Amino acid sequence: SMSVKKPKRDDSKDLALCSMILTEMETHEDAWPFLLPVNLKLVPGYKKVIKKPMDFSTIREKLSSGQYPNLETFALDVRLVFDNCETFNEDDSDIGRAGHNMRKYFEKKWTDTFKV
Numbered sequence: 449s450m451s452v453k454k455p456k457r458d459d460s461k462d463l464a465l466c467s468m469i470l471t472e473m474e475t476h477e478d479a480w481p482f483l484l485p486v487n488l489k490l491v492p493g494y495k496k497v498i499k500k501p502m503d504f505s506t507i508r509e510k511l512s513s514g515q516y517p518n519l520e521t522f523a524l525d526v527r528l529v530f531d532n533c534e535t536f537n538e539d540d541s542d543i544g545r546a547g548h549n550m551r552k553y554f555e556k557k558w559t560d561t562f563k564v
């Protein structure tokens with residue numbers, strides 16, 4: 449509270465570390481469904497069903513332009529990518545599978561990078 453400061457983790461490397469994780473995401477072989485925004489004019493349903501579209505290139509742009517206040521807002525957008533994917537795709541589809549795989553890949557890198 450006021451004048452009662454909690455000790456707080458060093459956050460000076462967060463931007464660089466998030467960029468690094470995002471690069472590992474981008475270069476994963478199952479990243480292809482998520483590299484670019486879904487084409488809202490070629491994909492039926494998507495615009496109406498998915499209220500907040502998100503993809504790696506949009507995350508990269510936001511990261512590169514200081515639009516994440518902290519690492520948690522970054523993780524929220526990354527998870528949003530995979531939550532959208534689950535909403536729109538069958539688990540037993542290539543894209544569905546890819547989403548699960550990439551989510552797992554992210555969360556381990558997240559834990560290993562920041563959870564001490």
Ligand SMILES: CCC(=O)c1c[nH]c(C(=O)OC)c1
Pocket residue numbers: 481482486490491532533536537543
């Ligand atoms: C034609 C199908 C298609 O373009 C598509 C289906 N699901 C998705 C998607 O969820 O991208 C992440 C794209």
